[PDB]
Amino acid sequence: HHWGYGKHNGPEHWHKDFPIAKGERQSPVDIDTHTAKYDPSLKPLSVSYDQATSLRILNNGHAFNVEFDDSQDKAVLKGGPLDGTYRLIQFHFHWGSLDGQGSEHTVDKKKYAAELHLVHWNTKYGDFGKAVQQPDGLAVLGIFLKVGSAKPGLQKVVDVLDSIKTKGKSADFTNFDPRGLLPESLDYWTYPGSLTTPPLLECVTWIVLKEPISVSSEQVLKFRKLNFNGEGEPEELMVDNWRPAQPLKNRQIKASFK
Numbered sequence: 001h002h003w004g005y006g007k008h009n010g011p012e013h014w015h016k017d018f019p020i021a022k023g024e025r026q027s028p029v030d031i032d033t034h035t036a037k038y039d040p041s042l043k044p045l046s047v048s049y050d051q052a053t054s055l056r057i058l059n060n061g062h063a064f065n066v067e068f069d070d071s072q073d074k075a076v077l078k079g080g081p082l083d084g085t086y087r088l089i090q091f092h093f094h095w096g097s098l099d100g101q102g103s104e105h106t107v108d109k110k111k112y113a114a115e116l117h118l119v120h121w122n123t124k125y126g127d128f129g130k131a132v133q134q135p136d137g138l139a140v141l142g143i144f145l146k147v148g149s150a151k152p153g154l155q156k157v158v159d160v161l162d163s164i165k166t167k168g169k170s171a172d173f174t175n176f177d178p179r180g181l182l183p184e185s186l187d188y189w190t191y192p193g194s195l196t197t198p199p200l201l202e203c204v205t206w207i208v209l210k211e212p213i214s215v216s217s218e219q220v221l222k223f224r225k226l227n228f229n230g231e232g233e234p235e236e237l238m239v240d241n242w243r244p245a246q247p248l249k250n251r252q253i254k255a256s257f258k
């Protein structure tokens with residue numbers, strides 16, 4: 001009886017195995033746009049993915065992860081609200097059963113169809129496992145997805161999904177360029193939070209872009225053909241793998257723009 005997204009093991013149960021679920025800096029949150037204050041001390045985000053080297057894509061039974069080679073100084077997030085440099089390790093998505101839900105963060109209570117998380121660890125801690133033990137260990141860049149025009153730079157991801165349908169399947173996935181997933185503007189909101197699945201560690205500086213990317217209905221429909229189950233087990237479509245907004249508590253959300 002491990003955690004997941006069902007009536008029987010979903011977000012409202014996680015606190016039993018992971019008490020920090022009811023902690024002081026949990027994610028995601030609703031971004032109330034009128035209350036977020038412009039911070040003129042915030043810097044432009046620096047996203048440098050020119051040398052990113054993808055290796056593999058993995059269905060982990062909750063989502064799929066596009067994994068990177070993080071053994072050299074290459075694909076780095078810095079600037080913005082961050083001190084120091086954060087190295088890209090993986091990206092994944094959260095999405096809905098319907099276009100009207102699927103994002104983790106919300107904007108004035110608006111739910112997007114999906115949300116992309118580009119995960120980076122602070123190089124001052126030497127690797128990911130040590131970084132997640134620190135309050136400034138990770139920086140997660142969150143990007144909303146809406147359904148409209150296709151995102152060409154997403155299609156290589158979509159087309160490999162047939163080969164990782166079920167939990168525990170992986171496939172080689174080299175030379176994927178995550179720059180093709182970024183919107184035009186790097187305007188963002190930022191706040192201190194957590195991982196959004198167990199273990200729910202309070203180790204993340206969240207940077208959520210204001211501009212969503214557009215993906216087509218056909219692209220998100222192929223996300224929804226993935227399975228949470230393993231091969232040879234009853235089919236459970238991989239949909240609604242998002243955590244609802246959590247209490248903001250004693251936090252401020254800052255805007256990079258206005």
Ligand SMILES: Cc1cc(C)cc(S(N)(=O)=O)c1
Nearest residue numbers: 117119194195196197198199
């Ligand atoms: C458990 C966990 C691990 C990683 C690397 C990333 C997340 S999230 N969804 O907060 O980006 C969760």
Ligand SMILES: [Zn+2]
Nearest residue numbers: 092094117196
């Ligand atoms: Zn995530």
